[PDB]
Amino acid sequence: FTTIHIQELACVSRDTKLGPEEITADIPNVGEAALSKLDESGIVYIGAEVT
Amino acid sequence: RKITQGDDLAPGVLKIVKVYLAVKRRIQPGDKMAGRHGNKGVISKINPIEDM
Amino acid sequence: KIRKVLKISMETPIGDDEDSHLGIDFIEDTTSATTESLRAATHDVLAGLTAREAKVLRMRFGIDMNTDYTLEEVGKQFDVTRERIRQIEAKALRKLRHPSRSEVLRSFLDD
DNA sequence: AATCTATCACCGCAAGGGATAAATATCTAACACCGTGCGTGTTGACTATTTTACCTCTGGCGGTGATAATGGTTGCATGTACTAAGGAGGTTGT
């Protein structure tokens, strides 16, 4: 009676006067272990556990 | 090029990003159970095999 | 150059006075107290560095003085030789390579 | 709060298991050397850092067209259940 689920979460980069917006991992001295799991683009890897 | 496809995201958005999660919602108390004959209710303790 | 219109004319993002708000009427202490903090942190590091090199690597664009001069008043406080007075503004890229060299500098996007 | 006999058993006290630390022998790492090549230095010529000047982009915004065009669009507030209030006006009464 353990169940298994698939759920979705998302984000955006708005049209600025140049055009892009930032996406990275820099949140210094706020919860460092909750950062250790990321791409160059600030995104988790397919296959990694997260909680 | 259904993956490398792009779509406009309306004026106000250059880009969008996603992540999906396989949430392993385990057996626990407070979760809900039933049988076919309309018995329906909360899991109200987990009992050792002899606590039964 | 079409998005010139579409970036702002639909319902307007928070662009304070587009980007010119950096140089407008706000240059009073309501902003420049942070300049007088980036300047403090760069004045710290660029005064612990090498006894010669610690001048140069402040010149041209407004870094450290209320008139951030070319040669005449700076060379007279560097002595011995010449336009090392300017080249060392860029030399930092290659043995100040060690990225820790900004450990006390980066806060002034954030205060 | 002292006394003990008489429980269920811990002590009474034999055995033996693991441990760790000694000595040996292996591993690696720390270093000191060397060599490479890069970011050690000034000088010099380049060309395009910045400024100002000039000649002549981009985009500020103000201005308003004429063969003539001269009765318009607009769809669903709501169908129920109540009932309190104001509105009507003729009249049989106050």
UniProtKB/Swiss-Prot annotation, chain C:
Site keyed Interaction with anti-sigma factors: positions: R60
Region named Interaction with anti-sigma factors: 82-97
Subcellular location: Cytoplasm
Effect of A51D: Disrupts the interaction with Escherichia phage lambda antitermination protein Q
The entry's DNA-binding region: 71-90
Region annotation (Sigma-70 factor domain-4) ranges: 45-98
Domain notes: Contains 4 domains, connected by flexible linkers. In the active conformation, the domains are in an extended conformation, each making extensive interactions with the RNA polymerase catalytic core. In the autoinhibited state, sigma-70 factor domain-1 packs closely together with sigma-70 factor domains-2 and -4, contrary to the extended conformation that is seen when the protein is part of the RNA polymerase holoenzyme.
Purpose of the protein: Sigma factors are initiation factors that promote the attachment of RNA polymerase to specific initiation sites and are then released. This sigma factor is the primary sigma factor during exponential growth. Preferentially transcribes genes associated with fast growth, such as ribosomal operons, other protein-synthesis related genes, rRNA- and tRNA-encoding genes and prfB.
Family from the record: Belongs to the sigma-70 factor family. RpoD/SigA subfamily.
Assembly and binders: Interacts transiently with the RNA polymerase catalytic core formed by RpoA, RpoB, RpoC and RpoZ (2 alpha, 1 beta, 1 beta' and 1 omega subunit) to form the RNA polymerase holoenzyme that can initiate transcription. Identified in a complex containing RpoD, the RNA polymerase subunits RpoA, RpoB and RpoZ, CRP and DNA. Interacts with Rsd; this prevents interaction with the RNA polymerase catalytic core and with promoter DNA, and as a consequence, promotes transcription from promoters that require alternative sigma factors. (Microbial infection) Interacts with Escherichia phage lambda antitermination protein Q.
Name recorded for this polypeptide: RNA polymerase sigma factor RpoD
Organism of provenance: Escherichia coli (strain K12)
Organismal lineage: Bacteria, Pseudomonadati, Pseudomonadota, Gammaproteobacteria, Enterobacterales
Shown residues within the full chain: 493 to 613 of 613
